[PDB]
Each structure stands twice: as structure tokens, then as C-alpha cells.
Amino acid sequence: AKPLNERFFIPHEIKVMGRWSTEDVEVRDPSLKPYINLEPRLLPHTHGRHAKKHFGKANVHIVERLINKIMRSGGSHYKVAGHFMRREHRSLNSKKVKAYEVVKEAFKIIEQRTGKNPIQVLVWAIENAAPREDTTSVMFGGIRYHVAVDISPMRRLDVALRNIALGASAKCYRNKMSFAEALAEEIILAANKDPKSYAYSKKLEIERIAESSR
Amino acid sequence: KADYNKRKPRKFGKGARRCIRCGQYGPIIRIQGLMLCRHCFREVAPKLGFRKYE
Amino acid sequence: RIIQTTGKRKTAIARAVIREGKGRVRINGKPVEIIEPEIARFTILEPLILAGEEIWNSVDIDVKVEGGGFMGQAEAARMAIARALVEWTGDMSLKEKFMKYDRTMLVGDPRRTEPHKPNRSTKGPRAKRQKSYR
Amino acid sequence: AIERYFIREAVREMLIDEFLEKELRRAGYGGLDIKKTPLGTKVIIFAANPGYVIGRGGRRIRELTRILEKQFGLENPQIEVEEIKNPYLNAKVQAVRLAQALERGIHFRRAAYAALRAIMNNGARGVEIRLSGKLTGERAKSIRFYQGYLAKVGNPAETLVSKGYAQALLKLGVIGVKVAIMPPGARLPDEIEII
Amino acid sequence: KARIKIASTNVRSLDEVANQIKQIAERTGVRMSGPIPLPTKRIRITTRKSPDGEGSATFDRWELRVHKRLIDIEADERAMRQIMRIRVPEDVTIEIELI
Amino acid sequence: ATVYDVPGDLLVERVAQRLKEIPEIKPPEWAPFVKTGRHKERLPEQEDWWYYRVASILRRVYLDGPVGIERLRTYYGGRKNRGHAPEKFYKAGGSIIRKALQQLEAAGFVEKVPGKGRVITPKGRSFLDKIATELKKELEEIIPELKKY
Amino acid sequence: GKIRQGFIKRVARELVNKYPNEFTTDFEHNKKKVQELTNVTSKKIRNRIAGYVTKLVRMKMEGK
RNA sequence: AGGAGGUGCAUGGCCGCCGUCAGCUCGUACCGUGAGGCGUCCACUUAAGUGUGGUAACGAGCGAGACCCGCGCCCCCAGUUGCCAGUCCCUCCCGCUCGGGAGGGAGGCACUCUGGGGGGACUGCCGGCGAUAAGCCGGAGGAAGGGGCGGGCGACGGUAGGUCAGUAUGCCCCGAAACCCCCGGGCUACACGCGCGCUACAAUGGGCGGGACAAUGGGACCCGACCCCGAAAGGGGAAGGGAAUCCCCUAAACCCGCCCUCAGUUCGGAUCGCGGGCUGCAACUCGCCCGCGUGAAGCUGGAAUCCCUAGUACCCGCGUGUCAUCAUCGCGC
Ligand SMILES: [Zn+2]
């Protein structure tokens, strides 16, 4: 199926996946710039390290975080698109090889469709899917009040990545679309800002609720 | 003719093994040939020399 | 002249011998170029790319790995190869480059498996059966 | 395998020890040990009252040899008797003696106090005796007498301290006696000296 | 050549026996191969603590360790007679082979 | 070149294609009606699975020789779907392996070391090495990093 | 928490009181000196005693 | 005599729980007629009644700590049954051999490993907070920074908590019967409610052929290589192994190529027919295994509810205890 050269690809430079560079990737907002990591690294695989260290996620490549995020099952105790996706033995959890292949295919599809760096498109998608305000309860006197609060950049990034992964899983669930195709569509739509993307829809909903409870 | 009150010879089954210390069935620990009831082994192990370094 | 190095990960032990040659790196009798999966191949190959093309072509390495899974064996081979290159070159610039890239290349990973305990030992140490109450 | 021989020897000595304790409980049984020799095996038993162990006319020793040979399978056994190094330092003998006194009829409180005083007079860092059962009424209860320094939790507690348990068969039930003794000279890791 | 296999449940007895054999060998002057410590055989037995079924399940892990050492000694009359009289404590077990 | 120098799957398929021309290697009369192992669910989907199996067995004998029927069965076993019960690993049937080894011996590629198993004859070594070197020559143009090996 | 035990504290204080000139601010020296001048048998206990003694000498030099 | 006959509201011993919680106490003194109080309280700190300072108290005991086992880095010794990196010989193969690869011999222990003894990590140092101390948050170095990481060890007392059906045991009871043996049946039933699990409701897949990688443990009527027969289950002969020498043991998830392309289907594997085997004295009640045929619910789940902070959770297989056969089970890997 796939060409033998691609099967036995041998990188020679230090760039993400050995195919895409990060020299020209730009982050606009100053809030997420410190946490959005574009360090030169051809293997986005840090194993389980940086979990123990507090604030250790600021030094993990974007692709590694996305791979870890998509390495899951979806659903479980939460409903997205109004359905559970409790897949136990068919899940990608604990399958980093499969998650890596999925991310690679999604990046290839994004590059083919858009003509731009897939990592740059992912940065745009994360920016557009990052919320800025939420609602939380505060306990004073003897009663609680709902109050609108800000979101730290780390939580913004985590929520954006989680929303992208859940959206891709939801639109690949029990359909004819492959998981890589679903991920590529999610990233493209999130970058394009159309409400069709689950990440952007959730960001808009969170912001609207924050405004209402403001 | 008085052949009764006799136990039939059994080669296998829960009736072919007795706890040497108390004479019991179900269970018998026969790891390494101990053939010791589980309670008896629990209360006797320190004398036999086993230690719980867990 | 030969130099020997060792690497360990999980339960995989890799012994590497580095010598001067044409740059043909062989692992367990197989060329490194046809190693699968691609993730494992990249893991093994990273130190050579970091060192550079000239050193890669100058020196050749023979590695023997035993124990562990494919990822563990790849990590052990990576550690052994990195140590062999550092010792052979004898320069501190690439050593600092290795430190700033991935500190664990020259320093092994001390993590090991936590022993299982009762109440679903087979599941794992902290795994347990769910209660029922009423 | 190799472990089979060790396990068999341990099981054999355990069985012999239990049987001999049952047979010689009244003689202040303290323990025994075996030694293999080319001609056979020599077993030495520690007893605070050899008179009874030896019996009269050399009959009890003959019977014990016959039993230890045929019943337990020991090959060519030679039985010897010895004195307890410190009868008041090992809990097993003291527990058996206290159970015997309780069976005889001495009041539990006075008997426990007398045994405890005797132990501390003979020499011990600390002593702790527990009596549980139908004491002073139908409703059972447990009481504890203690004095000195003793350890209950930890490796020093399990190693240094010597423990013993016995049961006294009274007319109206059974009473459990537990004795814990700390031999003199025991040094805990906590306390250290300066040179 | 003579092969000595020594096994025991305590390290110190094995150490003393090996030291005695080493002293005999060095006094004789013949070649000796230092005691090779074979892997220790640790047998574990897990048993339910409670004598009945009621109560949360909890188990105790009894363990017995056997340590083994191997020695190779050049075969000669004086040395073999000198090592045939080893103290061989009760716990230690000794096996002699010739090859 | 050597068998170690090329991927296993390509070499084994090429070796099966070459073995198709060897008169000694022919499928048994029961080949159409037999599963490869007790753990399998349905029959092979290849009308020429016999040659692929023989090539794989020959490569295994080459790499891990001497080998025997039981060890080859262990290698050719796999997981089984037991239904409601959890999946378990099972061995494979010995008839296919025994017949393939006998046919290879008749062809002269394998010789049996008594009490040890089956090792590869020099003829078989030459056969596999020739196929492997032609495969490596083919692969060199596609990927230029293997020229130095 | 890393808090000195009562016996560690008392032993270190009495050692420094009895031998003021045999202890300095170098932990490598202090551990050796504690080992020679005391019958300690545990690495951790000896290390903690030496550290406390070093802290005591540091405070003494500070003059408090 | 015997009793797996009642009594765990007569008991001993062991076990769960409050609770690995930090509490429970003693000598003298002091206050109150007394039950009792103080120390054991207050501020801060710790996982801790852990520690510093104040105090009508001064000292101490049991808990905690300490202690023991295993993992992680380094050093010394040891080198067979363990290891094969350099050196020499023999044999074989390739691109015909510049070069490269495999096996065996002698040989080595160089590396891994095995197992004894040592070192190392101690808030040690720098900055800051706290009061300058008790201590606390960061950083350098380091394999290991803050109890280094996981375990063993569960105090005074209570829980009339479970256990007499494991042993021991008081009273009562049966005592030719409730005692002891033998055959057959039952504990395996089945309108229904519940706990904990396995399998699935599919493409983050099913099938087919091919290609890689472990560890813990066990092995004498025992593990069994290797050879022959059989389509599979399975059958016959049989080396070595009393186990660092031989066997269980070339695991699966994962990777490559092809078919299936969203459908109750090439998902699902219950339920039944025929036929062939294994263990066992005995297989219908009531065992397990394999071939062909058959093909039920199930297309993601209401209120509610459970586990888990790192090599942890999830996913996936393996060893063992039970065992003549049988593991969707407990304990470990
Ligand atoms: Zn028993």
C-alpha cells in the first residue's frame, strides 16, 4: 500500500516528526505563548516524565500533548454529542504507536488540504478553541454565589486540546470517517472558526455562560 | 466378615490428604510437601523458620 | 580500538560496542535502517542525528539487547549508543547538547514496576474491587 | 530438590517438639534440639525438673526413645537432658508454670504478682503478663500486669522479646495466659552511648 | 578436581564454612576457585490470616530463603582429607563430587 | 548480503514464490480442508498458503536452527476467541509443520540433527542468501541508506 | 516531615557540648567524627546526628 | 470411646472494624470535701501527644518515630551450571569476496548477571519566609531532595462484631443412637430480586498469510526436548533435568499486505444436532477438549454509583494455589 520509502523513512534533521519544521510557526496571543512549546524535537515522546513535576507540562511538545490526549477512549462518565463512547478493548488508551500514526496521518491530510504547516494550523485551532472566562461558585457567609472567573493559560490549553480530541472522537464514532480524517476535520474547522467545530462551539458556549453569570 | 468401620484406600480427591497436625480436609497446603492445614501452617511457620519480610 | 557501554530500561539490557568504520549501525544483527515500528526506529536513531552526519559515518556500532518489550529495548539501545558516542568523541559540546535535549540519554531511567497488592492484585497495586454497600 | 530435605527436617522437629511438650508439660519443658552424627542422631531436651523427665528405673527414657524412633522416624536417637540456662528468662516455661498454678487453685491476682516479682528479681528489663478468660464471674474478661521496659511493635520487638502462651483447664472453662519478657542487656536502636 | 556444594538457611554459617575451606586451600597451596554464590532460592507462601470467612480479606506472605555456594578445589589426598573433617554445622548441608 | 539484511515479510513471500518451482514442495491432499491451527476461526484466504508457510518455516529453521516441531508449534500458535471466556494463547497443529519439514528435507534444504532438531543445509543457506541479496539489491535503489551495509 | 527526633537532638547537643573543638562546619568531617566518637550503627542516624551537629557549630560561629 | 450435634450471650487462640488514627497511661508535687483536674493546656510546626517557646509542674512508659525487607547509582571480592566483548583455529554462506555474515572449538570474565561486604542523600549548600530557633517554599550539584520509592511491624481499651464447621475447651444433649463404615441421590433445581465479573453492542475494527519483544514461578508415578502417526483434540517411543546445566518457554497487545466499507453485517457468540478424544474405579443427573452445521439478546445505556495522583490508571497476556480432569477465581509477573 504505502510506498517503501515512506515505510522506511529515515530523517536527517531535527524537526517534528522528521517532516515538518517549526521555524516559521508563530503564536499571536501573549497568554499562551509561554506555554505553547515549539522546541526542536523529532520524536514527540517524553514517556511519563514531567507528570510528577509541578507545571512540568510547559516543557512538553505540542504534538506529544495531542498524541497523549487522543490516546483515550472518550465518553466514559461524560456525554459529548449526547452519546457515550465506552469502548474498552477497542480504545487507543495505552497505544502510543497507534496514536502517533493517527496524528501523523491527520497532519498529512491537513497539509494536503490547506497547503500550510500542519503545526501552524494546529496552533491556530488551539488559539480559536481556547476559552477565556468561565463560571464557578464561591462560598461566603452561609450561601454560595456563582461568579465569572478568568482561566489560566495552562487550563486554556488543556481545555482546547481536550475539546479537539473529544470532537474528533465524536465525529469518528460509528461512522464511515476514519479517526485521522475526523481529527484533521476538527483541526481545520476549529482554525476556520465555523461553529461546526465542536471545540469552537464549546468555547462559544462557555463564554456565553460566563457572560450570563457575569 | 468384620470388614467395616474401615476407610477405603483413595489415591486422589480431598479425602486422600490429611493435615498431619489436626487432620482436616479442604484445605491442605502441599507446597514443597508441607501437607499442613492452612491455619496450622499460619500458626507454625515461625517455628519452621519462615519470616515475613514482605 | 573499541569502546563498550551499557544501558538499562524497564527490564531491557543493551550492550553496545563502538568502533571506527563506515557508519553501519547494526542492532541484534539487523541494520538500524529497517527497524520497525517507525517510533522505535526514531527513538534509536535520535542520538546519531544529534551527533551529526560526519561522526555517524565515521564510527560504527554493534548492539545486543535482551529483555523487555520493543520500546524498552529501543530505549536501552538509545542509552548505550549515546554513552558510546559521548565516550568515543570525548568532547563536551555534544555532551551538553545531549543534556539539554534529553537528560536521560546518558542517565538511565530509575522507574520500575510497583509490586501488586491484594484486593485486585492482578489488576495492579492501587486497583481494587468496587464496593456495593446496600 | 534441596528444599525438600530442609522442609522435612523442620516438620519432623516441629512434630517431635509438640509431642514432647504435651508429654512433659509438667517438667518445665523449655525446648530441645537435634544434632546429626555418623552413628545416628542426638536429641538434647532442656527441662527445669529432670527428675520427672528421667522418670524412675529408666522406663520413661526407653519409651521416649521408642516413640521418637518408630512414630517420628528418627534414626538411632540418643536422648539427653539438660538444665534451663535461665528458667525465669524464657516465657514458655513461666507461662506453663503460671497455668499450672492457676489450675492448682492459687488466686490469679496473687499468682501473677508472685510470678512477675520472681521474674524481675531473677533479672529482666521488662515483663508483661496477660490473663484472659472467665475470671471473677461468668462474663469473661482480660487483665494485664506489667512493669519495666518492653517493646511490642517493630523488628526489635519481634526479635529481642521472648513470648510464650499457655492454657489452664479450670473446672469451669479455660484461661489463656500470655507472658512477654525482655532479656537483660537488650539494646534498642533508639538509645546509644558516647565513647 | 572436587566440587563442593554448600547450602544453608543462614548466610553466616556458609561464610564460616567457606572461610574454613579457603584457609585449608591456601595452607595446602593448591589452586582454589572462590566461592561462587548461586542464586538464592526464596520460597513464598501466601495464607489467609482469618480462620473464618467473615471480615475483609487479608493475607500474610511467609518466606524461606536458602543460600547456596559452589567451590572447585584441585583434587589431592592431603587437601581432601583436610576438608573431609569440616565442622558442617547442623543447618549447613554439604555435597561432594569428583570430576 | 544475508537474511539478516532484509525485512522478513518480503524475503518470505519472495522465497515462497521461488519455492513454487521446486517439485518436492507440493501441498498435501488435505491442504484445502484444514485450518492452520486450533486457535484459528476459518480457513486461509490464500489458495497458495502452503508455500508461504513452508517459506516461513525454512526461514525459522535458518535463523533459530536447530528447531523442533513443538517449538515451531509454539511460534505458530496465537490467541483464540473462546467466546464468553477470556482469550487465551494456544499452540498450532503439528501435521503441517511436520509435513513441511519432511518436504524441505526431501528437497535438500534442511537436515535433522538427532536429539536437537532441524538445521539448514548449505544448499538452503545458499538459496536463502541468494534470494536475500537480490532483494537487498532491489531495495538499495528505493532507499539509499542500505548501500553501506 | 524532616524534623529532628528527640534522641537525635539530645545526642548531638551533648556531643557538641563535650567536644567543642572536635567538630567543624564541614559535614564530611562531622560525620566521620560522630562515627568515631559514638557507637552509632545506622547510616541514617549517624548522618542526621552529624547534620544537626554541623548546624549547631554554624549557629555557634554566627554567635547567637 | 466417639459426635462437622445446640451454645462464639460461658471461653482460649487468631481475624475484620473505630485506626498506621494519635492517642492511652505512670512516680512525686499542686488544686478541689468529692467524682475528678494539672502535666496531656496555649502560639507556631509536623503525617504524628513530631518539635520549639510560654505555663503549676518536674520526670517517665506504651504507641509514632526508630527498626527489618526489596528497588534505584558507585566501589571491593568472587566466575560455575552464569556471560562471549577482544585474540587464534576449523566449517559454511553470500554481491566471488576489497568487504560482510553464521556455527563449533579451544580460550577469556572484559560487559550483563548472580551474592557477600562497603560508599552514597544527611535540609548537605545558596536565596527567601517564619522569631534569629521549631520548621517551610524554590535553586545548584546529583542516580536518587525533602518520610528517596513500595512493603512488614496495628497501643491501652471497645466492638456480647465472625469463628465450637480448624485445632483446644466448660455445661447440656445422642450414646447402639446424632458414633463408625458402604452404595445411590442432593449441595449443580428455577416464574423471579440483588452483589461482583467475563463477553459484546464494531472501523480507536472482524478475518486471512507474514514479521518482532518479557518477567515472576514450578517440575519425581513430575516437567518432558527430540522423533513417528493424526485435519484438531489427541496417540506411541524417548534424551536431559533432584534443577544458574534439561523442560514448562519463540506470549498477547503492537507492526506490514490483502478482503470486508457502516450493515444485526465477514459485529455478537449464547442455544442446540451429529461425530471424535482426555482424566477418573465410575462422566446421565454432574467433568473438560476439538471438527462441521445452527446463529438468541445486544447498535453506547435513567435515577444512582465505584477505583485511581506515575511506571500509578487504562489496555493485554503469562506463572502459581486449588488439581487424577476442570479457572471467567485468589495471590504475583
Ligand atoms: Zn490443620
Side-chain angles (χ1 to χ4, degrees), chain A, chain B residues 2-53, chain C residues 1-119 121-134, chain D residues 1-48 50-195, chain E, chain F, chain G residues 1-63:
Chain A
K2 63 192 84 191
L4 294 174
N5 59 14
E6 200 64 35
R7 190 207 169 156
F8 295 125
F9 179 85
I10 293 162
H12 283 305
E13 293 179 353
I14 297 300
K15 40 183 178 178
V16 182
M17 284 270 179
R19 281 81 167 275
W20 305 282
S21 173
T22 57
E23 287 288 79
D24 291 331
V25 181
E26 175 175 344
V27 193
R28 292 183 291 113
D29 63 344
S31 160
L32 284 164
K33 187 185 285 185
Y35 292 67
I36 299 282
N37 201 62
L38 277 296
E39 181 182 1
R41 182 176 298 286
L42 65 87
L43 189 78
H45 196 291
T46 75
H47 283 276
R49 300 159 196 134
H50 308 303
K52 301 156 276 285
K53 190 174 65 163
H54 197 198
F55 286 98
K57 312 180 290 187
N59 296 359
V60 181
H61 208 273
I62 298 170
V63 184
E64 164 58 12
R65 289 173 59 74
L66 195 64
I67 291 158
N68 290 328
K69 295 265 181 174
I70 65 161
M71 162 159 60
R72 61 185 294 160
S73 311
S76 291
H77 55 91
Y78 40 88
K79 290 194 182 189
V80 60
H83 294 285
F84 277 136
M85 283 73 74
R86 294 159 164 163
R87 63 189 92 184
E88 293 83 3
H89 65 293
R90 320 181 297 234
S91 43
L92 284 181
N93 63 187
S94 195
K95 280 164 193 190
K96 202 134 188 179
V97 182
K98 292 180 84 72
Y100 176 91
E101 292 304 281
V102 163
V103 170
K104 192 211 297 180
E105 207 76 6
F107 278 21
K108 290 182 184 293
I109 288 162
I110 289 160
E111 193 190 23
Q112 188 276 333
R113 283 176 74 203
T114 301
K116 182 62 66 68
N117 198 296
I119 307 185
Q120 177 51 83
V121 180
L122 172 57
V123 164
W124 282 334
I126 286 159
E127 168 51 85
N128 284 346
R132 312 153 92 200
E133 211 177 44
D134 206 327
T135 187
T136 186
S137 185
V138 188
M139 202 60 179
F140 292 163
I143 46 173
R144 74 281 191 191
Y145 289 103
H146 299 71
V147 176
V149 291
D150 298 322
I151 299 194
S152 297
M154 185 180 288
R155 180 145 198 87
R156 296 180 81 215
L157 174 50
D158 293 352
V159 167
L161 294 178
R162 204 191 93 105
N163 290 338
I164 290 163
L166 277 296
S169 193
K171 65 178 72 66
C172 77
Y173 186 53
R174 291 201 288 203
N175 320 313
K176 195 135 195 172
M177 198 158 40
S178 82
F179 186 29
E181 293 159 5
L183 185 55
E185 289 292 325
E186 181 64 61
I187 289 168
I188 292 280
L189 299 185
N192 291 126
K193 295 185 178 178
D194 62 342
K196 182 64 69 177
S197 77
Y198 177 87
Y200 200 70
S201 296
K202 186 65 68 175
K203 185 207 159 181
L204 294 168
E205 175 173 34
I206 290 161
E207 275 202 347
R208 186 274 304 278
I209 295 281
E211 182 65 26
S212 70
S213 179
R214 186 200 272 221
Chain B
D3 191 4
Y4 289 89
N5 320 119
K6 58 94 205 177
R7 175 144 298 281
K8 181 175 75 173
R10 297 182 184 281
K11 182 175 174 66
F12 47 81
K14 309 293 281 192
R17 292 180 296 283
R18 294 179 66 188
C19 180
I20 62 170
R21 195 163 175 281
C22 72
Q24 181 179 358
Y25 303 140
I28 298 292
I29 297 170
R30 50 175 178 174
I31 297 166
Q32 295 297 109
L34 291 167
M35 295 296 172
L36 268 169
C37 167
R38 76 182 181 84
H39 317 268
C40 306
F41 175 81
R42 201 185 100 79
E43 75 188 46
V44 164
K47 305 166 34 164
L48 294 169
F50 294 70
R51 297 290 187 270
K52 280 173 56 178
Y53 326 90
Chain C
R1 180 182 171 182
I2 67 172
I3 297 293
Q4 300 172 193
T5 53
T6 312
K8 278 140 77 176
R9 186 76 165 72
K10 292 266 181 80
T11 77
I13 314 182
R15 299 196 288 279
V17 185
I18 183 166
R19 190 167 25 226
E20 55 274 33
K22 300 293 189 292
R24 31 195 182 178
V25 177
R26 197 177 290 271
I27 291 163
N28 189 359
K30 291 173 71 174
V32 68
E33 318 307 339
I34 55 159
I35 298 291
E36 293 179 353
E38 183 212 299
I39 194 171
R41 186 167 63 245
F42 282 25
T43 304
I44 299 181
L45 183 63
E46 270 196 305
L48 277 296
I49 291 159
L50 269 173
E53 326 191 314
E54 69 285 13
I55 300 176
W56 184 4
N57 283 4
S58 70
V59 296
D60 63 358
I61 318 183
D62 210 321
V63 182
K64 300 289 187 293
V65 182
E66 268 194 335
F70 60 103
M71 281 311 303
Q73 289 197 337
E75 277 207 86
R78 186 274 304 278
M79 293 180 183
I81 285 156
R83 292 181 181 177
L85 275 71
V86 167
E87 176 151 33
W88 179 272
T89 311
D91 186 358
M92 295 298 102
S93 288
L94 73 165
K95 193 195 170 69
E96 291 177 353
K97 183 168 70 178
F98 289 5
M99 295 298 102
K100 64 91 177 178
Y101 186 86
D102 185 23
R103 192 181 92 75
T104 197
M105 294 182 286
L106 311 197
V107 174
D109 207 359
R111 286 178 293 172
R112 295 273 182 289
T113 67
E114 185 164 315
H116 290 188
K117 303 165 181 61
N119 207 345
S121 68
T122 186
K123 284 279 174 58
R126 278 74 172 276
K128 292 188 281 290
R129 191 189 77 176
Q130 54 162 70
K131 275 75 71 175
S132 64
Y133 292 118
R134 299 156 179 178
Chain D
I2 193 66
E3 282 84 37
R4 299 268 168 174
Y5 155 70
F6 285 61
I7 293 299
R8 186 182 292 154
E9 292 312 295
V11 165
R12 192 199 297 284
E13 61 85 20
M14 183 278 288
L15 275 299
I16 288 171
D17 177 274
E18 294 293 328
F19 179 82
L20 284 167
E21 192 276 330
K22 182 62 66 68
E23 197 76 3
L24 273 50
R25 71 178 303 256
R26 72 186 66 186
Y29 205 112
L32 76 166
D33 59 301
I34 303 296
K35 303 172 78 79
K36 181 68 175 67
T37 55
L39 73 165
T41 60
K42 64 185 287 184
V43 62
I44 62 170
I45 60 173
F46 315 130
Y52 178 75
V53 159
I54 302 298
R56 281 82 65 193
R59 283 86 60 86
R60 156 157 275 127
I61 300 299
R62 190 151 62 208
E63 293 293 328
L64 286 179
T65 298
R66 179 67 180 271
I67 295 297
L68 264 59
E69 172 71 29
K70 299 289 96 175
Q71 175 169 340
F72 300 86
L74 273 172
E75 63 277 16
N76 188 358
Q78 295 298 109
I79 296 170
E80 199 188 352
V81 170
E82 185 174 1
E83 294 293 328
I84 302 284
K85 296 296 196 303
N86 289 113
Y88 297 88
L89 270 287
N90 65 332
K92 294 187 286 185
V93 159
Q94 301 300 305
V96 171
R97 291 179 182 177
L98 184 49
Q100 288 165 359
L102 269 298
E103 190 277 330
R104 189 179 299 111
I106 296 95
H107 200 70
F108 67 95
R109 196 171 298 270
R110 76 185 287 196
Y113 273 113
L116 200 153
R117 268 202 283 287
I119 298 282
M120 290 290 259
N121 188 359
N122 279 108
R125 273 275 305 265
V127 183
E128 191 270 337
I129 300 179
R130 296 183 64 86
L131 308 172
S132 305
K134 293 167 63 169
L135 310 167
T136 61
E138 283 284 293
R139 182 67 178 270
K141 55 193 298 189
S142 177
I143 58 172
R144 183 188 71 140
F145 292 164
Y146 85 92
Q147 65 182 177
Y149 304 151
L150 186 61
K152 295 179 179 182
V153 174
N155 181 66
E158 69 183 1
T159 302
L160 308 167
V161 177
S162 177
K163 291 177 70 68
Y165 151 78
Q167 69 178 354
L169 194 150
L170 275 293
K171 178 192 157 204
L172 75 165
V174 174
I175 293 162
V177 308
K178 294 196 282 186
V179 185
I181 304 166
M182 212 165 187
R187 297 291 99 189
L188 297 191
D190 184 359
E191 64 185 1
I192 59 170
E193 293 83 3
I194 304 153
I195 286 281
Chain E
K1 281 173 155 291
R3 182 139 298 184
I4 307 294
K5 290 191 288 183
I6 70 182
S8 179
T9 49
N10 51 1
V11 185
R12 296 282 76 77
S13 297
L14 293 152
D15 184 10
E16 294 294 328
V17 170
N19 288 318
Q20 186 178 8
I21 293 282
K22 191 261 185 185
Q23 293 298 108
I24 294 159
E26 61 86 20
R27 184 177 63 188
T28 297
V30 288
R31 179 70 272 170
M32 183 177 176
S33 300
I36 300 93
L38 300 179
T40 311
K41 189 64 166 36
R42 312 183 310 115
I43 57 178
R44 276 85 72 79
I45 303 170
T46 298
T47 45
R48 179 72 177 274
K49 285 208 209 187
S50 81
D52 62 317
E54 187 270 355
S56 69
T58 197
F59 318 82
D60 63 358
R61 281 80 62 84
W62 302 110
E63 186 171 359
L64 183 65
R65 301 194 204 190
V66 186
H67 322 79
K68 311 195 213 180
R69 276 96 168 87
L70 177 79
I71 296 165
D72 188 76
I73 192 73
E74 182 64 26
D76 48 348
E77 182 65 26
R78 72 185 308 285
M80 59 85 74
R81 296 295 86 193
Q82 289 161 294
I83 62 170
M84 187 66 204
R85 179 66 179 86
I86 296 282
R87 186 185 295 92
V88 64
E90 69 275 16
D91 55 51
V92 184
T93 187
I94 190 69
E95 293 82 3
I96 301 299
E97 294 293 328
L98 74 164
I99 193 66
Chain F
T2 310
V3 172
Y4 300 94
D5 292 331
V6 297
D9 57 357
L10 315 189
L11 188 153
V12 65
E13 60 85 20
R14 183 66 59 84
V15 165
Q17 288 306 128
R18 298 292 183 184
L19 273 173
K20 288 214 193 192
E21 316 182 318
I22 308 297
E24 293 82 3
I25 312 308
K26 66 186 288 185
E29 182 179 1
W30 43 259
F33 301 101
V34 163
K35 287 192 303 197
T36 51
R38 169 260 296 287
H39 62 285
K40 293 283 164 48
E41 190 167 356
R42 57 193 82 157
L43 316 191
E45 299 193 359
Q46 293 82 17
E47 297 304 299
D48 52 356
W49 65 269
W50 179 256
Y51 300 97
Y52 281 71
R53 171 54 57 90
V54 170
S56 175
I57 287 164
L58 181 48
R59 188 170 171 280
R60 289 266 82 70
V61 166
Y62 171 96
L63 288 174
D64 291 331
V67 299
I69 294 159
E70 208 70 25
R71 296 192 193 288
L72 293 168
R73 283 174 76 207
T74 296
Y75 174 85
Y76 286 116
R79 193 177 55 171
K80 184 184 175 167
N81 183 3
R82 290 165 66 209
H84 286 325
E87 303 88 337
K88 174 148 66 160
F89 170 90
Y90 285 106
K91 287 191 196 207
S95 292
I96 288 169
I97 295 164
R98 187 158 38 84
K99 291 302 197 308
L101 284 171
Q102 291 171 338
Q103 285 181 2
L104 276 159
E105 195 192 324
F109 292 131
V110 181
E111 201 188 71
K112 63 178 74 175
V113 183
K116 267 288 196 60
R118 322 292 192 94
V119 299
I120 190 166
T121 314
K123 260 185 64 152
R125 197 170 263 282
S126 165
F127 194 63
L128 277 296
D129 282 297
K130 273 184 185 301
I131 295 167
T133 191
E134 58 170 60
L135 175 56
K136 178 165 185 300
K137 278 185 163 190
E138 277 165 23
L139 292 162
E140 274 174 319
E141 293 82 3
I142 296 90
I143 190 161
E145 298 295 328
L146 271 62
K147 312 197 77 62
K148 63 188 180 293
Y149 296 86
Chain G
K2 281 193 163 53
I3 71 191
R4 284 73 169 265
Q5 307 185 56
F7 77 107
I8 302 297
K9 287 182 181 292
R10 82 186 64 176
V11 167
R13 190 170 291 111
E14 65 183 1
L15 287 171
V16 68
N17 188 358
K18 192 184 281 184
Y19 306 138
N21 68 333
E22 303 318 325
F23 286 92
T24 59
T25 56
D26 190 359
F27 179 88
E28 285 59 15
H29 205 194
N30 296 120
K31 59 191 286 174
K32 293 180 176 68
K33 290 291 180 66
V34 166
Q35 167 57 304
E36 292 104 8
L37 296 170
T38 308
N39 60 13
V40 65
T41 43
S42 286
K43 281 183 178 176
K44 302 171 59 154
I45 301 299
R46 187 255 293 140
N47 293 7
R48 288 206 285 277
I49 292 164
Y52 193 86
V53 169
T54 305
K55 183 68 70 174
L56 293 192
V57 188
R58 261 200 56 83
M59 294 182 286
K60 287 176 75 67
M61 185 64 72
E62 283 183 355

